[PDB]
Structure 1
Amino acid sequence: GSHMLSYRHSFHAGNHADVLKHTVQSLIIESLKEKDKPFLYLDTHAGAGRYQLGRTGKYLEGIARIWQQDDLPAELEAYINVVKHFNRSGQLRYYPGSPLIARQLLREQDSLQLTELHPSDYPLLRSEFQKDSRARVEKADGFQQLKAKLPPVSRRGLILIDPPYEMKTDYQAVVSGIAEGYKRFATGTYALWYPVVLRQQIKRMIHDLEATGIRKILQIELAVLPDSDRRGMTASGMIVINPPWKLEQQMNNVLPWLHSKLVPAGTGHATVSWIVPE
């Protein structure tokens, strides 16, 4: 029944892409918290909120390989402490999605705006925030939120754009969506997650992004395999517009260690570079 929901299972949750994406999300959130003034966290495609972990699930090759390491880099501590918060037993059973990363890291003065259209994931997302007055949860198109909900009343925020890329149109929708939001709120930090399945698609998306005229665009990408035309997702990345001051240095500090744990064979790459500088 709708009154007692079961958490969503996921085969993919906590994989290498989630590790990179939620690491970057947490580092941005922590930087925004360097000023007392409130900020908004806007999650265009928020998912269910958390996922129940288990074909052994990909978490065993991603989050599991890092969360208990004695030499965890300092830059990962905020992210990993959220993971630990949802797994007190010391065994990995739940992976916190981006909405719960934000729920645990945001302060009393901050706000959350979360949208999800998936008919089974949305009721779980609503349930994770039933008793959190800072959050608004809606069953609505995520790209539209970049028009309707920006700029925030607080005039500060992190906007996470992280659609499924089930439809090829997502590669276009993310760019025009960013353009709509940026025009309304040019000082926000926009973080876009993308998968590398065909490099050509990401090459075209980035070309479109440059054509918006938007400056200060950082690219962070972790590949577990070199580019292919037949291996599924070989890599994922975070494109960050208006990245916080220390983000580039943090990712240069942490990507070699992350790649050594996430990619035992040492294949692929892990890079930070500027698509468009200041």
Structure 2
Amino acid sequence: SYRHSFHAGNHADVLKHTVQSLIIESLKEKDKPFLYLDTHAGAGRYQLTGEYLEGIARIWQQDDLPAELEAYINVVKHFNRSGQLRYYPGSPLIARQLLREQDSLQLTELHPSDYPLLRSEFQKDSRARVEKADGFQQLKAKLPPVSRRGLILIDPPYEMKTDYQAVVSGIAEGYKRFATGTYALWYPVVLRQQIKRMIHDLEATGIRKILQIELAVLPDSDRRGMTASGMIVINPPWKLEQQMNNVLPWLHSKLVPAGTGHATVSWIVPE
């Protein structure tokens, strides 16, 4: 039975899957195949009361949906053709629906209950390989892709402050093996100081061309839980900065009617 999740489809998922879909659509502009590598792939889909009421529900049926959200929202509608929100597609299903016949998917998830669900989403998809394995080890084992093109999505649990260091080390290892790939790292903002230190750690790797996309629903706080989330993109498609500048004001206005927080795009390290 599909996994239920109180947080699925919230503002952070909206931002993460919007960015994912735009990167995939840019990669599809060239006919050459590419790899989609999902290090922390989850269950695949989520059965939706819940934070989706403040996230995807606020945008998916809007008449003025920006063109930059059409690919993502059309996947959500594919899984909800009745017009009632019942299922939220995870990053693996976004990729399954947007990738072309010549592209490849490599998905990993250690969760003992969610790995079987993920496997069942791809049992009839010959483009995909699903493994019950550590996500960061895939940045060593699966890179570089034989196709020499790819999006690597890194979407891990952040459960203590050593995890923030593990993500940067993992990315450095992937980048050493595949310096031209696009790496998209999702992060939460609970304590801003922890994100500031992670970003410094990422800069200290020497990797260039790192874009930061962040959407906050509340100002930074000491005891409000997750107030924001973002995507750090290494080697973003050239269009992505402008696409996010086009869509972030609309997205923030729909996700946060009270107008609190912010939505920004900027460079951590330039080319």
TM interval, shorter chain, is over 0.9
Q: CA deviation at 1:81?
A: 0.2
Deviations for 1:208-238, whole angstroms, at most 9, x for unmatched residues? 0000000000000000000011000000000
Residue 265 of structure 1 is matched in structure 2 by 258
Q: Distance in 2 between matches of 1:217 and 1:251?
A: 15
Which of residues 33, 37, 40 in structure 1 aligns to 2:35? 40
Describe the SS at the equivalent of 1:182: helix
Which of 168-177 and 249-258 deviates more? 168-177
Q: Distance in 2 between matches of 1:223 and 1:132?
A: 36
Q: Distance in 2 between matches of 1:268 and 1:17?
A: 13
Q: CA deviation at 1:170?
A: 1.8
Deviations for 1:100-123, whole angstroms, at most 9, x for unmatched residues? 000000000000000000110100
Describe the SS at the equivalent of 2:219: coil
Residue 88 of structure 1 is matched in structure 2 by 81
Which ranges of structure 1 fall in alignment gaps of 5 or more residues?
1-5
Which aligned pairs between 1:225-244 and structure 2 lie closer than 5 A? Answer: 225-244=218-237
Deviations for 1:148-196, whole angstroms, at most 9, x for unmatched residues? 0000000000000000112332211110000000000000000000000
Q: Distance in 1 between matches of 2:71 and 2:139?
A: 27
Residue 11 of structure 2 is matched in structure 1 by 16
Q: Distance in 2 between matches of 1:118 and 1:51?
A: 14
Describe the SS at the equivalent of 1:260: helix
Describe the SS at the equivalent of 1:142: coil
Q: CA deviation at 1:124?
A: 0.2
Which runs of 4 or more aligned residues in structure 1 lie more than 6 Å from their structure 2 counterparts after TM superposition?
Answer: none
Q: Distance in 2 between matches of 1:164 and 1:260?
A: 28
| CA-atom RMSD in angstroms | 0.5
Describe the SS at the equivalent of 2:193: helix
Which aligned pairs between 1:194-233 and structure 2 lie closer than 5 A? Answer: 194-233=187-226
Q: Is 2:179 aligned against 1:180?
A: no
Deviations for 1:18-61, whole angstroms, at most 9, x for unmatched residues? 000000000000000000000000000000000000xx200000
Normalising by structure 2, what TM-score? 0.99
Q: Distance in 2 between matches of 1:24 and 1:251?
A: 8
Q: Sequence identity, in percent?
A: 100
Q: Distance in 2 between matches of 1:86 and 1:248?
A: 29
Describe the SS at the equivalent of 2:112: coil
Q: CA deviation at 1:242?
A: 0.2
Deviations for 1:66-115, whole angstroms, at most 9, x for unmatched residues? 00000000000000000000001100000000000000000000000000
Q: Distance in 2 between matches of 1:223 and 1:121?
A: 29
Describe the SS at the equivalent of 2:100: coil
Which of 113-122 and 158-167 deviates more? 158-167
Normalising by structure 1, what TM-score? 0.97
Which ranges of structure 2 fall in alignment gaps of 5 or more residues?
none
Q: CA deviation at 1:17?
A: 0.1
Describe the SS at the equivalent of 2:257: coil
Q: Distance in 2 between matches of 1:154 and 1:169?
A: 33
Q: Distance in 2 between matches of 1:275 and 1:151?
A: 24
Alignment coverage as a number of residue pairs:
271
Describe the SS at the equivalent of 2:170: helix
Which of 175-184 and 162-171 deviates more? 162-171
